[PDB]
Nucleic acid binder design. Structure first.
Ligand SMILES: Cc1cn([C@H]2C[C@H](O)[C@@H](COP(=O)(O)CP(=O)(O)NP(=O)(O)O)O2)c(=O)[nH]c1=O
Ligand SMILES: [Cl-]
Ligand SMILES: [Mg+2]
Ligand code: NA
Ligand code: NA
Ligand code: NA
Length: 326
DNA sequence: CCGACAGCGCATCAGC
DNA sequence: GCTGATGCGC
DNA sequence: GTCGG
């Protein structure tokens, strides 16, 4: 946290560009800069010093100089005072409300929590659950609670079918002392890249987690991806735990290593690694790593029997999950 | 200068 | 209904 | 907004 002031400023710029400007590449440019500065192991003394880092160009360098000189950024000061921008930024904090819906709601005069609450019938299902748990979803999850949640999910999954394997990924697998949500990778031998010998593989697990009242709400659900809400049980006379976001991703069992590389992240780590793969003439998704032909067209899946195999292909030294928090 | 920026699941809608 | 684009999310 | 070619 040597450069917390700078990385906070860049993140706020990132969020502005995403939510208000709807300029997604600016968003990702700012997040990449924040990431590389966050892991830079010196307290930055100037914009020129920061500009040496990949992802920091002239414009961000000038902003860092302004920020270092004054402790603030005029551009941000004004954005903060703009009502429309402030409203749009707020609304997008609701899960299921993105840049477009936020701006549309503001047009219709819906721009506070109070407005949303009295206009529940103007929300889709995802948005309505996002609003319901607005407070809860912004709270952090202590790793100690993540461990309890892990135990429940792994044990309930076992009770459905002992051949299921559930792996908690995301920030939890990277060793984080707190997480924003729980991400669960799921495999079953019936579901491979070659065949699906059993239906409802994901459904069965979701149903069981609902039965024991762990899963409380659903944001979206298909054959391979569940996005919803869960809650730890609490003891007698205890205040309830907050509700938590949970993502579950069923991946073909022979593609587990690509799947667990993907779901472990971070998102910026994946973007960096996938970008590097492309420069090395490969393409990586959660399923496979494939070569790129001269045309750029993806070839056939390369054999993969470990996370490290994927790193090897693109000539990266292996990085343990705890070192992937970019 | 300027094209590219990771890659994809689910919900929703327009157009047929 | 299907298909493709878009929004939002991982 | 940044970067590689
Ligand atoms: C948001 C996002 C996630 N992912 C993958 C990598 C994440 O580590 C993983 C879980 O996504 P989350 O949105 O839950 C972020 P996290 O890394 O789990 N940290 P936390 O949930 O604690 O905030 O999905 C991507 O590949 N691209 C993405 O844009
Ligand atoms: Cl952009
Ligand atoms: Mg997570
Ligand atoms: Na740079
Ligand atoms: Na949102
Ligand atoms: Na998640």
């Amino acid at each position: 946290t040597l450069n917390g002031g700078i990385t906070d400023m860049l993140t706020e710029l990132a969020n502005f560009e995403k939510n208000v400007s709807q300029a997604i590449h600016k968003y990702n440019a700012y997040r990449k800069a924040a990431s590389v500065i966050a892991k830079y192991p010196h307290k930055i003394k100037s914009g020129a010093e920061a500009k040496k880092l990949p992802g920091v160009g002239t414009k961000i360098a000038e902003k860092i100089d302004e920020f270092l000189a004054t402790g603030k950024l005029r551009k941000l000061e004004k954005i903060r005072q703009d009502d429309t921008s402030s409203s749009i930024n707020f609304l997008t904090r609701v899960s299921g409300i993105g840049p477009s819906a936020a701006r549309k709601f503001v047009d219709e005069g819906i721009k506070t929590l109070e407005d949303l609450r009295k206009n529940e019938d103007k929300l889709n299902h995802h948005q309505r659950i996002g609003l319901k748990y607005f407070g809860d979803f912004e709270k952090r999850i202590p790793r100690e609670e993540m461990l309890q949640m892990q135990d429940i999910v792994l044990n309930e999954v076992k009770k459905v079918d002992s051949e299921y394997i559930a792996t908690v990924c995301g920030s939890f697998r990277r060793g984080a002392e707190s997480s924003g949500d729980m991400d669960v990778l799921l495999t079953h031998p019936s579901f491979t890249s070659e065949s699906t010998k059993q239906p409802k593989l994901l459904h069965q697990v979701v149903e069981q987690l609902q039965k024991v009242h762990f899963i409380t709400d659903t944001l979206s659900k298909g054959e391979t991806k569940f996005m919803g809400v869960c809650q730890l049980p609490s003891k007698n006379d205890e205040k309830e735990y907050p509700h938590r976001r949970i993502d579950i991703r069923l991946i073909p069992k022979d593609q587990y290593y690509c799947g667990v590389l993907y779901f472990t992240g971070s998102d910026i780590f994946n973007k960096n690694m996938r970008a590097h793969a492309l420069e090395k003439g490969f393409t990586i998704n959660e399923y496979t790593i494939r070569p790129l032909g001269v045309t750029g067209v993806a070839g056939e899946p390369l054999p993969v029997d470990s996370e490290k195999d994927i790193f090897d292909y693109i000539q990266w030294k292996y990085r343990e999950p705890k070192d992937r928090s970019e």
